[PDB]
Amino acid sequence: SPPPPNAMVYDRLAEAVKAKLRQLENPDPRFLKYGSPRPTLTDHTRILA
Amino acid sequence: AEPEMEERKLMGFKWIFVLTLALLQAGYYRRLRWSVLKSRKLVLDVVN
Known part of the structure; x- marks a missing residue:
């Protein structure tokens, strides 16, 4: 009863x-390949013509 | 050593007796002010 x-x-x-x-618990690892929330410093020389 | 022992045992019989009457008044006064709360009925909507 x-x-x-x-x-x-x-x-x-x-x-x-x-x-x-429960649909916030299984992330897809192919949508996480290039983006990052940590800032880094990069080189832009090839496109600056 | 103790010249006060007869003035002391006679004052302590008068005030322990008188204070056990104020304890019977204060337990009636307590249970009279608390009886509306201790017997109220309450309906709430919740089951489990």
């Missing part, structure tokens, strides 16, 4: 916040 986790509105509004957060 505990309520099942879809019976109360506040219990099944909480299984939908856990499912929105």
